[PDB]
Amino acid sequence: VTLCSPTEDDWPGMFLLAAASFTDFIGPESATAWRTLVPTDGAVVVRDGSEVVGMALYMDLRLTVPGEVVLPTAGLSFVAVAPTHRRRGLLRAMCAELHRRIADSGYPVAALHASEGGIYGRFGYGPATTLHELTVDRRFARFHADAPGGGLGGSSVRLVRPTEHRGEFEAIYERWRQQVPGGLLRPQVLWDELLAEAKAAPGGDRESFALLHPDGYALYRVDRTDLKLARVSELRAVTADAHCALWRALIGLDSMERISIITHPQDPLPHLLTDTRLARTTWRQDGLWLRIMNVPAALEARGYAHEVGEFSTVLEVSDGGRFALKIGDGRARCTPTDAAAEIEMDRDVLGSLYLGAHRASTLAAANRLRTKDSQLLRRLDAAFASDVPVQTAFEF
Amino acid sequence: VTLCSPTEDDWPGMFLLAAASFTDFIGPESATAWRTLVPTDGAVVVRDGSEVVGMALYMDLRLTVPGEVVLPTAGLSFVAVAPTHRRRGLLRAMCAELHRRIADSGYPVAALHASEGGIYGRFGYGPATTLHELTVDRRFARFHADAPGGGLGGSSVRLVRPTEHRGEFEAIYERWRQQVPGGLLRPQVLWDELLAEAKAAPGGDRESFALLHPDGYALYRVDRTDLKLARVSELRAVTADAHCALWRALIGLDSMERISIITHPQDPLPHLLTDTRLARTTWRQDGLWLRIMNVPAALEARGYAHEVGEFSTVLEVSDGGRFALKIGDGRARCTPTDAAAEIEMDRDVLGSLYLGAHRASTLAAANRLRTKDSQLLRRLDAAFASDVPVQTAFEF
Amino acid sequence: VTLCSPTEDDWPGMFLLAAASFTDFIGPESATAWRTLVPTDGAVVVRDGSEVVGMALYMDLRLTVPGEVVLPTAGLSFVAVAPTHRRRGLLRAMCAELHRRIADSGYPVAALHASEGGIYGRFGYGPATTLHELTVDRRFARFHADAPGGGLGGSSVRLVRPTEHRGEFEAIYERWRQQVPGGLLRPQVLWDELLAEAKAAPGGDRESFALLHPDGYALYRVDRTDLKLARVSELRAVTADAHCALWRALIGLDSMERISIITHPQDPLPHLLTDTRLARTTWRQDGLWLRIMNVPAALEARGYAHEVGEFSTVLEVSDGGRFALKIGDGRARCTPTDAAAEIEMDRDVLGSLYLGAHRASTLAAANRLRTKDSQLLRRLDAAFASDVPVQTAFEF
Amino acid sequence: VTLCSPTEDDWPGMFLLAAASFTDFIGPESATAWRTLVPTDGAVVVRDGSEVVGMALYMDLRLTVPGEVVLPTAGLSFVAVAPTHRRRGLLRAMCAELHRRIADSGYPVAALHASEGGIYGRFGYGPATTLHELTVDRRFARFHADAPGGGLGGSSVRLVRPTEHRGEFEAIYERWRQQVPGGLLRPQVLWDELLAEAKAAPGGDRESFALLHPDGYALYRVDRTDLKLARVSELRAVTADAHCALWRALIGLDSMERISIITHPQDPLPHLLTDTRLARTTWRQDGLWLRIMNVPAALEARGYAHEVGEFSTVLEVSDGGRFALKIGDGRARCTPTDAAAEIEMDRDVLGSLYLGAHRASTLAAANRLRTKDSQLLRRLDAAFASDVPVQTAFEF
Numbered sequence A, B, C, D: 001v002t003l004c005s006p007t008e009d010d011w012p013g014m015f016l017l018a019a020a021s022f023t024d025f026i027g028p029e030s031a032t033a034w035r036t037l038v039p040t041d042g043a044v045v046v047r048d049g050s051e052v053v054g055m056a057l058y059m060d061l062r063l064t065v066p067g068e069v070v071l072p073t074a075g076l077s078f079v080a081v082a083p084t085h086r087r088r089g090l091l092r093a094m095c096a097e098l099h100r101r102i103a104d105s106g107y108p109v110a111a112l113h114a115s116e117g118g119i120y121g122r123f124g125y126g127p128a129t130t131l132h133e134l135t136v137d138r139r140f141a142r143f144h145a146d147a148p149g150g151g152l153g154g155s156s157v158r159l160v161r162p163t164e165h166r167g168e169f170e171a172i173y174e175r176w177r178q179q180v181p182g183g184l185l186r187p188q189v190l191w192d193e194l195l196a197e198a199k200a201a202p203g204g205d206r207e208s209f210a211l212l213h214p215d216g217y218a219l220y221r222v223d224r225t226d227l228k229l230a231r232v233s234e235l236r237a238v239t240a241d242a243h244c245a246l247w248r249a250l251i252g253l254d255s256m257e258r259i260s261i262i263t264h265p266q267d268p269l270p271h272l273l274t275d276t277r278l279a280r281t282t283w284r285q286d287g288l289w290l291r292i293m294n295v296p297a298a299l300e301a302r303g304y305a306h307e308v309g310e311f312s313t314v315l316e317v318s319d320g321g322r323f324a325l326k327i328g329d330g331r332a333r334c335t336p337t338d339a340a341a342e343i344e345m346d347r348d349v350l351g352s353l354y355l356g357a358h359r360a361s362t363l364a365a366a367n368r369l370r371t372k373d374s375q376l377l378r379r380l381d382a383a384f385a386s387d388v389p390v391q392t393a394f395e396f
């Protein structure tokens, strides 16, 4: 029972484990395409002895963080342990090896989407974005007098077939992802999957349609069983006008009773309507999880709020070093020190703070970060806050 | 069909309207007690001609706002129009008269809880606090190693009968309400109702119990139909230690599968657990609504964030005046001006900003506040943010 | 095991059987009051040997039939056989004896409400009125421009406490029942029950309210578990204006999502709205059942449609005689004959035709009435039709 | 943004709009076949400027009305406005143009099936047939002694594969449609669709079977998720014997708990059983909607009840002319007049009366038709009633 990088002959066995582990498994053809995102030595397998009983890999990603800074990011995925080999330390062994490789490769951060919420905190990952499902009872929905694009003339939005406007979705998304913390570059094989999923499937999903604006798009489909529910699979808007225009069109889906979308807590949609309550939050969950691999590289790469005045402190990460952290003029400097720590936190907690989705004060109230100075808390809060709201790009 | 302050003889007819309008009507005896909170001329009725077909009143309240400042507050309630007299302008006439009286009396703010979300925005009220229901599957709940109060020895929390510790709940609450934005002074007749509701009722609620800590309490009861659900009706904690201790006790309710609570978006509970996902957000809604009656008095009374540096701007409220607004050193100065507006918003929008629950940027993205300067937005965001998270005290 | 009229000492045992047989049993006090509606020798019991194992009775009622003619009517009720004595012929023996007594007493018709639909047809009862539940989604409900009482000024409807306006409900109902086929005189002990049921009950129904118009009233209550549903227990309108006015008030119940009512198939409510579909038929069932005791007395007492021209036929009822039936000028003459039958039907079928709720053609298509002449069918159809729609007064 | 007849190049864009608007869209191949039912200039499109944002058409149909008279009928269908172009007057503009064309072409009536009930009344369409879903708990179902075809020997009904007996279904249906008000000629491309829908589909409907009698057929299938429910998609019976025989066979579906069918309010099925209650009405909705295009042509073409004696009146349709209406000997004469109106109604109301499904009295009680003479009401009621019950042929 040993651990190594898979050879070509291991992949059929990995796909078997994948099929048995993931109910949404994209299948061997598509998985084989996604292998193009996995660097050489980006994967590990555990063989029994013979067959594969554990696996994990990372993909090369590009993550936007506050200040519109794009970081090379190791995206952990395809993680599975056979049901025959539970409680044998296989996950811990696989994660340790990949983390070794990721750090040595020079990635400042790693990221993943969690199947369950109790697994990845012990390996240094903190939840860093928040998924927020809104369900709109569109039959009652009326736009506020203040809402953009209500006046006379035509609409700027077109109802189109997704496959015929791939180039335009790509361009809009590429713009979106570079300006939003949480944004990920979406490579071509992921655009292949997305448009493949836009098609109707016998006994599966219904056909998807798109609403296209120069500065935004929405992909939606009627739910397979609830025929009065339209599910927006993706809405990417680069301006506020595009966002409002797209929502006017979606609320114009007169066949539907309800429109649902997985969005973020700061989505302005509720405020576009005369009754903000009609945009019901029906589900809330962690999105992207972050493990800061190199504390000073990560903290220095990020932009910080200009509103907070220059301050200096000493931050200890529980097994990640102690640093003199100086933040001013929207930038941080983060250098080694053995001076007494003013702030202490586990590595995962820093991941949760990093994109601005959780407040230091909130984590402090849970005692997940310790400081004896409340002014320092207020300052961290303000400094780490993100000007542009944090969003979740796509699952991987 | 005319409008006036009710005489003693009008109250039976008001209670009839109340019983027919409010399914949770507290009843004539209790309502008669709550009349002690209504000042002379704090109520209006519309009679047909004969009988009462419309009513509304306000109560004298004390609202804590950021900076731990307590404002006299007119709490609109007991608002009803007979089903026989809809679409007759009775609400608009009643609200206009009470607002006249409230302004003339010198209240800087009015507040209410909304039965529906589409009614009160046109009368200048903006939703200002957010209710967040968390449902915990306590069978899986395990506290994080970092969570306060996990070590050896005894517990600081006692399981008690609510009626035998009224004095202690009052003292704890009084402490809580003075330090939390959204806090309301709870007068004695409301403590009477609360403890009356703590009792079992034939065919109604089950008996309530309390968990009591020196610096916090929780009132809870098993749900009447779902006998594996405990509903926490109220949890007031003055320290983080009290909050964690109370949640350790609640999660020790081994008969239950689930614990539910109506709390706020920044409740640190999820971070107390190894699996933050177990604290499921199962419901989200507007709580307290605010109408700023006097813009400069309200804006000057409030504390602002010290982190943001001094700045000056010109704010116009749509039918509420234009002001030179200077914010520095955590205080605002707000004086009349006819200089060009740099920020414009409806009166309700200011109410929504006032306690720090909604961000100016978010409202701007919906075009509910207009400015052509994004630096000004960032500054408003930071300035109006609340250090202590905004909470909802009690419904009225 | 024998059959006789109960003595005073039998009633406790009857109430025991009643309590065990009827989940809506009104209880011993109320049942003792309803005994005032049972004539001397109007009840039978079967004793074992000792205890009561079967019972049945009739009450003296007054039934309005087409032509506004009021008939003395034997209302069968309180019918029960002990679960220990099923399939022993007790029901058949009890019904035969009461029918003997009812016929000998001079009642031309008997009537009942059926617990199950397969029991009473063999004893000569046909379902004669139809219950039609409408559920209105009142949030979308808008009255048609043509609907009565939409203009300026006040409302004619008042929201009142049921107990304070008993006299007015009685007068309105008394008017209603005399002009509607299916109408029943409601005696004082039934008005006692109705107003007793209007009260809230601990762990039971919520408080009832009333909407009162000079020519109509509605009694309604919020549903005990579905707090967004108002159930109209009774709506009696003597004019169309009263009916529309009452429905405007009910649709003005702005707290509710839905209003439900048990009404009749010809209720004009759906046509009062711009979207007739919003008045959803959510349930349909037989109401009053009728056994014609004396065929010629019943048929001659009834009014018939003036539109159909004079015709003559020969009707045979399967064990109820053969008659020369001449119908003209809205009246029938029904005399014995041994001439060949042109129409044949079981006795129950005639009951179903009698108030005009079922068409002869429809029953003919099922072969429940046989004739070889389709012109005769059309004529029966038209003649037996009721000008005023058939309604159900109250359950007994 | 302009309106015109589509060219061949517009159809792909229409199919896109169709796919996005109609969840039951039959698809481009089938839709292309149904184009054969659309006459030259029977369609309109609204283009933006470029793409199609609105569409509507009519098909050439043949509608049976009372008296077994068959009328050329314009069947409105394929009506859609893009969700991007709501509230822009596009529907009103499209309907006005098609109505102009339909009238000028010489159609006396137009018809449609409504997606929602609040849309088409303002354009002159009244609901004219009523869909009535019956659900039979067949495990308790026992046929009445009187029911046809209960005796010894064989059955007249055969269980067959739908595709192998198309000719016989066509012949039976053709007979049915000519004798029933509401009947529509079903052209070959609709028989193509029907038999295509009879096939099982991967992840869709189960296989359909047929029960075939010389004078009737039923098409049924087991429900895809509820495997104890058989849904009768169509039952067409030309005699009562065929109808009863088919229902005996359906109730012989011993694997099923329930049989459901969309039928009409006068279906004799309930009366075929000993317990009429077992035929539960589980759903009720408007079926065919009718717009009378030419009032005198429509009213004169129809047969009327012979039972009512000759009468004359003056009918005004709100923007459709005033007519001297003389009805006698089952025929009407309808000529222009400026004499005072005795009856007034909107055009849609006349559509609702036309096939005999709604009574003039009922509509009068809602004030949807005004007259000051109740004898005239009774006469209209009787005259417009249909001897043969009104049914709904098929959706289009």
Ligand SMILES: COc1cccc(N(C)S(=O)(=O)c2ccc3[nH]c(=O)c(=O)[nH]c3c2)c1
Pocket (backbone or CB within 6 Å): A018, A022, A023, A024, A025, A026, A027, A030, A031, A032, A034, A035, A038, A077, A078, A079, A114, A115, A396
């Ligand atoms: C090289 O192939 C790759 C590489 C990376 C990702 C994927 N997928 C998208 S997957 O196989 O369908 C896939 C992978 C991991 C999952 N993990 C889960 O916890 C879960 O629920 N579903 C999952 C589905 C394929």
Ligand SMILES: COc1cccc(N(C)S(=O)(=O)c2ccc3[nH]c(=O)c(=O)[nH]c3c2)c1
Pocket (backbone or CB within 6 Å): B018, B022, B023, B024, B025, B026, B027, B030, B031, B032, B034, B035, B038, B077, B078, B079, B114, B115, B396
């Ligand atoms: C002087 O008596 C007062 C004064 C102030 C408040 C109250 N109540 C607590 S109440 O009558 O039960 C009450 C009042 C208003 C309501 N409004 C609603 O929209 C609703 O849903 N319930 C409501 C219940 C009694």
Ligand SMILES: COc1cccc(N(C)S(=O)(=O)c2ccc3[nH]c(=O)c(=O)[nH]c3c2)c1
Pocket (backbone or CB within 6 Å): C018, C022, C023, C024, C025, C026, C027, C030, C031, C032, C034, C035, C038, C077, C078, C079, C114, C115, C396
């Ligand atoms: C002399 O006392 C009488 C006389 C006549 C009627 C009544 N009731 C109203 S009852 O007892 O509650 C009652 C009686 C019969 C029922 N039959 C049913 O099939 C059923 O479901 N409920 C029933 C309820 C009391």
Ligand SMILES: COc1cccc(N(C)S(=O)(=O)c2ccc3[nH]c(=O)c(=O)[nH]c3c2)c1
Pocket (backbone or CB within 6 Å): D018, D022, D023, D024, D025, D026, D027, D030, D031, D032, D034, D035, D038, D077, D078, D079, D114, D115, D396
């Ligand atoms: C020329 O092609 C035609 C012509 C006429 C009809 C049809 N169809 C049967 S359809 O496209 O599937 C179709 C059309 C209209 C609809 N309208 C609705 O409100 C709805 O719910 N479904 C609908 C489905 C195709």
Ligand SMILES: [Cl-]
Pocket (backbone or CB within 6 Å): A062, A063, A064, A070, A177, A178, A183, A184, A185
């Ligand atoms: Cl990126």
Ligand SMILES: [Cl-]
Pocket (backbone or CB within 6 Å): A066, A067, A303, A304, A305, A385, A386, A387, A388
């Ligand atoms: Cl930033």
Ligand SMILES: [Cl-]
Pocket (backbone or CB within 6 Å): A262, A263, A264, A391, A392, A393
């Ligand atoms: Cl998002």
Ligand SMILES: [Cl-]
Pocket (backbone or CB within 6 Å): B062, B063, B064, B070, B177, B178, B183, B184, B185
């Ligand atoms: Cl306070």
Ligand SMILES: [Cl-]
Pocket (backbone or CB within 6 Å): B066, B067, B303, B304, B305, B385, B386, B387, B388
């Ligand atoms: Cl503050």
Ligand SMILES: [Cl-]
Pocket (backbone or CB within 6 Å): B262, B263, B264, B391, B392, B393
């Ligand atoms: Cl709270």
Ligand SMILES: [Cl-]
Pocket (backbone or CB within 6 Å): C062, C063, C064, C070, C177, C178, C183, C184, C185
């Ligand atoms: Cl009567």
Ligand SMILES: [Cl-]
Pocket (backbone or CB within 6 Å): C066, C067, C303, C304, C305, C385, C386, C387, C388
């Ligand atoms: Cl009559």
Ligand SMILES: [Cl-]
Pocket (backbone or CB within 6 Å): C262, C263, C264, C391, C392, C393
């Ligand atoms: Cl009724």
Ligand SMILES: [Cl-]
Pocket (backbone or CB within 6 Å): D062, D063, D064, D070, D177, D178, D183, D184, D185
């Ligand atoms: Cl036809």
Ligand SMILES: [Cl-]
Pocket (backbone or CB within 6 Å): D066, D067, D303, D304, D305, D385, D386, D387, D388
């Ligand atoms: Cl006819």
Ligand SMILES: [Cl-]
Pocket (backbone or CB within 6 Å): D262, D263, D264, D391, D392, D393
């Ligand atoms: Cl039908």
